[PDB]
Design a protein around this ligand. Structure first.
Ligand SMILES: *[C@@H]1O[C@H](CO)[C@@H](O)[C@H](O)[C@H]1NC(C)=O
Ligand SMILES: *[C@@H]1O[C@H](CO)[C@@H](O)[C@H](O)[C@H]1NC(C)=O
Lengths: 98, 49
């Protein structure tokens, strides 16, 4: 799970918001994005190549906000065999404030 | 500007009263006409800016 898409039209008719983590950055951005119907990324466990695609939007017109950071979602320390992590998020959009 | 500085603009119409600190940059036509109003214009269909 790299992130989320949010909005009211999802197709550059209105504004909409993009959250993603790629192979280095975390990025949050808000534009009239013409998103893809099947937005996704390829790795297949990095078996013979690493990250080399961005299939999420075909265009981004007048982006009114953007922010970026170092890679979020740290992995658990030390490991154990088939041990796993619960990641947990609440999103609210109230008083003009996500 | 004495020629008129028409590069400053406001909104004349909208579906609904917006929420505080919402911001709407839609350029869709406001259908004050009853019938559906495809494309750029029609009877009481308004470019909103
Ligand atoms: C991740 O996406 C951001 C925003 O498009 C971009 O600046 C950055 O170059 C991308 N990261 C990599 C490793 O290319
Ligand atoms: C959004 O894009 C349109 C068409 O290019 C332009 O006329 C409009 O001024 C842009 N809005 C902003 C806030 O830049």
């Amino acid at each position: 799970i790299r992130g989320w898409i949010f909005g009211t039209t999802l197709d550059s008719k209105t504004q909409s918001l993009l959250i993603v983590n790629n192979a280095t950055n975390v990025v949050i951005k808000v534009c009239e994005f013409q998103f893809c119907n099947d937005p996704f990324f390829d790795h297949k466990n990095n078996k013979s190549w690493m990250e080399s695609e961005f299939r999420v939007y075909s265009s981004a017109n007048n982006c009114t906000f953007e922010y970026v950071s170092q890679p979020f979602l740290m992995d658990l320390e030390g490991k154990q065999g088939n041990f796993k992590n619960l990641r947990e998020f609440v999103f609210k959009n109230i008083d003009g404030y996500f | 500007k004495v020629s008129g500085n028409y590069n400053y603009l406001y909104r004349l119409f909208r579906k609904s009263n917006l929420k505080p600190f919402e911001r709407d940059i839609s350029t869709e036509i406001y259908q004050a006409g009853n019938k559906p109003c495809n494309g750029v214009a029609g009877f009481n269909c308004y470019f909103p800016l």
